[PDB]
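haha ok so turns out i had the wrong file open the whole time. this is the CORRECT one, sorry everyone. sequence first:
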Amino acid sequence: GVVTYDMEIPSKVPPVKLYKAFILDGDTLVPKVLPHAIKCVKILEGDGCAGTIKEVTFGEGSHHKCVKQRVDAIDKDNLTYSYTIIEGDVLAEKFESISYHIKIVACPDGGSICKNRSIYTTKGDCKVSEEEIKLGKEKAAEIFKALEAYLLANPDYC
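then structure:
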């Protein structure tokens, strides 16, 4: 059994800049602008090549705990990014792998569209509420829009 959903969103930053900032610094930009939902990120293993592993702390309090995250494929041909939540508190008694599938596409407004799919391959075919799917979609959109709030002022991440 597997859960699967998406959060495709137009974004006020160009596709090459989304690739530099969001994809190629989804490891030190993603916590620096919203540490109430990504308190930390560090690498446990690798460098960004396929099979690289991060570990994540979300807010370090009674709201949420921890995640381990295998980078599956960064690909600059598409633009795309896959990574799997492989371990940590978030999978719980419901999910067993939250494998993201981001695609990035241009827009003439001076921006992009970011097609954030995710898989969620379950344990024991456990059911989940669509309101909790919204809570997951909405925390991801809150992290994303914190990076865009920097990238609308400063789209050239370095």
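Helices lie at 15-23, 29-32, 130-151.
again sry for the mixup
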